[PDB]
Each structure stands twice: as structure tokens, then as C-alpha cells.
Amino acid sequence: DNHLSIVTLEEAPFVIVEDIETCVRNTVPCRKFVKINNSTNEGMNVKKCCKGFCIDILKKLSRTVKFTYDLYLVTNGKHGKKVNNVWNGMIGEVVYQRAVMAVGSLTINEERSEVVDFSVPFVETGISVMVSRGTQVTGLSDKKFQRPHDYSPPFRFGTVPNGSTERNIRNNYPYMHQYMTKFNQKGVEDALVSLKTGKLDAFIYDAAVLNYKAGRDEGCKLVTIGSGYIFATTGYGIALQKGSPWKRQIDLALLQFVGDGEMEELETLWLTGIC
Amino acid sequence: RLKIVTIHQEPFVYVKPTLSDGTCKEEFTVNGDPVKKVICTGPNSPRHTVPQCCYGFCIDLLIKLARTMNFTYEVHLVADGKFGTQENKKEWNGMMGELLSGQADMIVAPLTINNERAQYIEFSKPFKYQGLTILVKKGTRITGINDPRLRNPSDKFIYATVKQSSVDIYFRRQVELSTMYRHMEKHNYESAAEAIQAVRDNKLHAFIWDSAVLEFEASQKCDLVTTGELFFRSGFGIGMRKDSPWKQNVSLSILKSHENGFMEDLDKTWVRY
Numbered sequence: 145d146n147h148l149s150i151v152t153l154e155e156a157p158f159v160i161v162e163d164i165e166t167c168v169r170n171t172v173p174c175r176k177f178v179k180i181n182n183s184t185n186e187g188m189n190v191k192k193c194c195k196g197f198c199i200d201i202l203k204k205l206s207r208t209v210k211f212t213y214d215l216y217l218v219t220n221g222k223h224g225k226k227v228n229n230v231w232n233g234m235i236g237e238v239v240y241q242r243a244v245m246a247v248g249s250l251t252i253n254e255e256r257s258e259v260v261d262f263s264v265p266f267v268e269t270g271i272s273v274m275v276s277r278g279t280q281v282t283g284l285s286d287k288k289f290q291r292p293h294d295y296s297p298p299f300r301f302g303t304v305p306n307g308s309t310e311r312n313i314r315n316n317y318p319y320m321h322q323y324m325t326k327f328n329q330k331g332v333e334d335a336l337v338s339l340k341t342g343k344l345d346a347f348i349y350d351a352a353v354l355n356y357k358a359g360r361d362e363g364c365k366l367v368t369i370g371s372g373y374i375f376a377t378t379g380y381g382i383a384l385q386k387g388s389p390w391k392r393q394i395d396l397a398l399l400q401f402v403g404d405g406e407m408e409e410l411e412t413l414w415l416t417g418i419c
Numbered sequence: 420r421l422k423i424v425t426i427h428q429e430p431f432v433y434v435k436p437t438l439s440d441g442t443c444k445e446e447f448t449v450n451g452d453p454v455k456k457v458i459c460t461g462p463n464s465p466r467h468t469v470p471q472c473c474y475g476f477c478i479d480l481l482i483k484l485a486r487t488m489n490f491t492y493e494v495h496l497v498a499d500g501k502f503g504t505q506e507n508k509k510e511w512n513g514m515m516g517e518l519l520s521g522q523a524d525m526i527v528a529p530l531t532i533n534n535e536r537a538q539y540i541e542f543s544k545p546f547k548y549q550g551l552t553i554l555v556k557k558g559t560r561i562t563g564i565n566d567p568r569l570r571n572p573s574d575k576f577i578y579a580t581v582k583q584s585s586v587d588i589y590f591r592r593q594v595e596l597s598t599m600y601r602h603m604e605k606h607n608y609e610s611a612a613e614a615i616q617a618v619r620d621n622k623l624h625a626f627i628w629d630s631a632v633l634e635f636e637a638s639q640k641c642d643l644v645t646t647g648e649l650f651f652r653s654g655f656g657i658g659m660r661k662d663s664p665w666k667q668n669v670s671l672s673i674l675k676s677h678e679n680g681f682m683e684d685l686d687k688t689w690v691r692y
């Protein structure tokens with residue numbers, strides 16, 4: 145009743161997962177359902193530990209709004225995608241009432257707000273483009289992105305599919321999206337290696353994550369275009385069930401956190417970069 | 420028909436007198452398109468209301484929300500020219516007071532989302548992401564929010580903000596800024612335009628205000644510069660009463676406009692050129 149089921153997903157530096165049998169220091173306990181094999185539905189919850197920027201936000205919210213929680217990591221998808229009118233990922237966990245809320249690098253967009261409630265944004269994000277330093281790309285609407293076959297050889301660029309970034313590209317730039325799919329990257333780290341090794345000219349992804357990776361790139365060779373420009377500005381938000389009685393208190397707490405300068409310490413704790 | 424309240428705040432809300440025939444002059448944007456204008460009433464002390472002409476970023480956003488959600492509207496300027504602050508009993512002034520008293524059904528203005536206001540009204544998702552910065556006369560050398568002339572102030576360097584604004588509460592509520600707040604309380608200005616003019620005429624040496632406003636002023640008036648980046652992030656939101664039936668579709672339309680480039684076009688039309 146006052147003990148809430150909360151789902152999360154690992155994406156450094158906002159949610160970081162570690163092994164353990166008692167979580168220590170700034171980490172909180174988070175469980176992950178791990179299957180026995182692929183011929184059964186059997187599995188077991190592995191006790192792990194979670195930390196990061198969004199975990200510190202959850203620790204603050206738990207202290208301020210006064211609630212306890214059982215945190216667990218999503219295993220059915222990632223952030224959230226509507227497949228055959230059925231939501232998976234963290235959104236799906238909230239939509240189908242397996243979790244009271246979702247905390248992490250979860251992007252607020254319109255189609256998700258139709259099925260879940262979002263708190264006020266607390267981490268500014270959107271769509272950015274990471275390239276090797278010096279690449280001439282004006283933005284998302286650059287002709288190398290819009291009309292990629294007007295160039296020989298064509299520009300090579302991709303994203304990590306099934307997230308809010310691909311969803312936006314699929315609706316806004318049809319030709320760009322269908323050309324992009326052959327450059328889909330399994331994850332951020334694969335995309336970074338694809339960039340540095342010359343297999344990829346540009347990587348389009350969540351703004352806050354690319355901002356963090358740019359500041360920590362070895363030699364500071366990978367940069368975001370426009371000096372950290374963001375298309376379709378939005379933010380990470382706490383997802384809640386529609387009509388959740390927790391939303392108002394979560395919003396007031398988040399606005400009170402930023403209003404009293406408490407965000408700066410979490411920023412210097414998790415988000416700083418040398419570059 | 421919704422009663423819209425707003426406030427003079429370029430480049431978000433321009434305010435010009437009507438023509439002799441009670442109409443607004445036909446003007447054109449930076450891209451050759453016609454500038455959409457609406458008639459807005461407001462005072463020019465007693466407050467004699469006169470029809471005037473409104474246009475800008477927020478007016479374009481208001482027109483989009485009206486066509487998208489199918490509602491009619493009448494626009495008027497806030498009577499006391501203030502954004503909104505809660506000052507035995509407490510009382511809201513400015514656009515906040517007009518929204519809660521029923522004088523307005525919706526606030527369409529560069530209205531900062533803070534904990535104080537969200538306790539009484541409903542904010543949409545932010546339609547503009549910006550922050551706080553400092554405007555100074557070109558040649559004035561201060562590092563930023565942590566400059567000694569600001570943290571250990573005297574009468575040799577005057578800085579202030581707008582009275583009864585979100586920035587005014589910002590320095591009042593944070594005890595870490597108490598030194599700065601007691602310096603500004605004696606010099607806060609009634610409007611941003613007056614404070615900006617005071618920096619031009621070297622009557623005010625630093626203006627702490629919204630970055631989307633101050634950076635636009637520095638782009639059009641080259642004797643003014645902004646020092647440092649943003650020492651604080653803030654955002655503007657549509658303001659409605661908590662029982663409004665339009666609040667969910669308003670917020671969804673804000674997200675849609677962000678995600679299809681409409682908010683970016685407005686930023687190109689009104690902010691960055």
C-alpha cells in the first residue's frame with residue numbers, strides 16, 4: 145500500500161548495476177529475474193545492487209514523499225516500445241500495473257503520455273548526434289541525413305532501435321529512417337566503437353547519454369554537434385499509472401529538489417566529464 | 420470561450436498599439452510569412468483598459484493550441500504587469516492571482532515552473548527549456564553567479580531582477596543566496612524591459628533574468644552581453660487551474676509540437692535569427 149513496486153533499467157550513468165550479500169554505500173537493492181533456460185518459463189530473482197543519478201533521485205523521493213520500494217530491473221524489453229498495440233519495457237511494466245512507477249533514463253514523449261503519467265522532467269534530454277570531431281553536420285535536418293543517397297559514398301549513420309529516438313525518426317523522416325535501419329547498433333558501446341573505428345559516420349541517440357559519453361571520451365575525439373544541440377527537447381520523467389495518487393507529491397518533491405540547489409550535487413556526482 | 424492572460428515579454432509576447440481603425444499593422448516574419456496577431460486588452464494608478472496588439476512566440480503557441488484543441492479565446496494583459504508571487508494570510512499576485520481568481524482560464528506566457536506555483540495551479544510539460552543568466556553592459560567584467568561583486572556586494576555594483584517574478588522567489592527561498600537577495604530587494608525593477616533599459620543607461624550593472632529573454636536582447640542590442648552560461652535550469656509552461664478539462668490535451672500538444680519540430684520553428688522565427 146505504502147510499499148511500492150518500482151521498475152528500472154541499467155544505463156550508465158543514470159542507473160548502474162553491480163553484483164553483491166548486502167548492498168553497501170550509495171547502492172540500493174535491486175532484483176533481476178534471470179531465466180533458467182530457453183525451454184522453460186522458470187527463473188529466479190538474482191539480488192543485485194543499483195546506483196546512479198536516477199537512483200539518487202529515487203532515494204530522495206523515497207525520503208521526501210515517504211515511501212518504501214522493491215526495485216527490480218525490467219526484462220521484457222528496454223525503455224518502452226508499443227508492439228502490436230502492446231507496450232513493453234518500463235512503460236509496459238507501468239501500463240499493465242506490475243510497477244507503481246518507473247525510474248531511469250526514460251524519455252517523456254507524446255505517445256507514452258497517452259498510456260502512462262509522467263512527472264515533471266528532471267534531466268534535460270532529446271535527440272543529439274555524436275560524430276568524430278570536425279564532421280560537418282548542421283543538424284538532424286542536414287541533407288546527408290535527409291537525402292543520404294545524394295552522396296557517393298553515402299553518409300553512414302544509425303541509432304539504437306526500439307527507443308524514443310527511433311520512434312521520432314520513424315514519424316518525422318521516413319526516407320531517413322528506412323535508410324538508417326541497416327546501421328542499427330545493439331547498444332551505445334557498440335555504437336561508440338563503430339564510430340571510433342570508422343564503421344559509422346554519425347550516431348543519433350538520447351541527448352543526455354551522448355552528452356555524458358562525449359565528456360568522458362578518451363582523447364575527446366567524439367563530440368555532439370551544435371555544441372550539444374538537442375532536437376525535440378524533452379526530459380527524463382518518472383512514469384506512473386494514469387491517475388496515480390503519487391504524481392502530485394512526486395512533482396512537488398522534484399521541483400523542490402531543483403528549487404533548493406540539490407540537483408547540482410547529483411550533477412557533479414554522476415554527470416561530470418573531463419572533455 | 421477561454422480567457423487568456425499574458426504579459427509583455429519580448430520575444431515571447433510583443434505588445435504594440437492598434438492602428439487608428441482598431442486593427443494591427445500587417446507585418447511579416449523573418450521568413451516572409453505573415454505575422455499572426457491577436458487583439459489583446461490591457462492598461463497603458465488607475466488601469467484604463469484599451470485594446471492593443473499582441474504577437475510573438477507565445478501568441479503563435481496560443482493559436483496552435485486553439486486550432487489543435489478547438490477552442491475560442493480572448494487575450495488580455497495581466498493587470499498589475501507581474502508574473503506571479505505569493506506574498507497572516509498569503510495572496511497570489513500577477514498572472515497567478517488572475518488564474519486562481521477566475522479572471523483568467525489559462526496562462527500563456529514565459530511562466531517559470533516552480534514548486535510554489537505548482538502547489539496551486541497545473542503546469543503543462545515545458546514548452547521552452549532555458550535557464551537563468553546575467554545580463555551586463557558590454558565591458559563590465561564579472562565571471563557569473565560566483566563573482567565577488569555579487570557574492571560580497573556593495574553599493575559600487577548594483578544588480579537586481581524583476582519584482583514578484585519566479586527569479587525573485589528564487590533568491591528569497593535559498594538561504595545560501597541570502598546575501599545576494601538583500602542586495603537586490605532594494606533595487607528590483609517593476610518589469611524586465613525597464614531593468615534591461617537600466618543596464619543600457621548604466622543605472623543597473625547586472626540583470627539576473629531568464630536566459631531565453633536576455634540572450635535575445637544581446638542578439639539585437641550589441642551593447643549588451645550575457646556573462647557565463649546558465650547557473651540554473653528552468654522552463655516555461657502553460658498555466659491552468661487544477662480542475663481544467665483542457666490540461667491533459669494541452670500538455671500532449673506541447674509534446675507533439677516539440678517532437679514534430681514546431682517548437683523549433685518558433686525558436687527560429689522568434690528567438691534565434
Ligand SMILES: Cc1nc(C(=O)NCc2cccnc2)cnc1OCS(=O)(=O)c1cccc(Cl)c1
Nearest residue numbers: 264265266267268379402407532545652653654
Ligand atoms: C525537475 C527539474 N529539474 C531541473 C534540473 O535542472 N534537473 C537536473 C538536470 C541535470 C542534468 C540535465 N538536466 C537537468 C530543472 N527544472 C526542473 O523542473 C523544472 S522544469 O520546467 O520541469 C525543467 C526545466 C528545464 C529542465 C528540466 Cl530537466 C526540467
Ligand SMILES: N[C@@H](CCC(=O)O)C(=O)O
Nearest residue numbers: 223250251307308309350
Ligand atoms: N531514453 C530513451 C532510450 C534511448 C533513445 O531512444 O535515445 C527512451 O526512453 O526510449
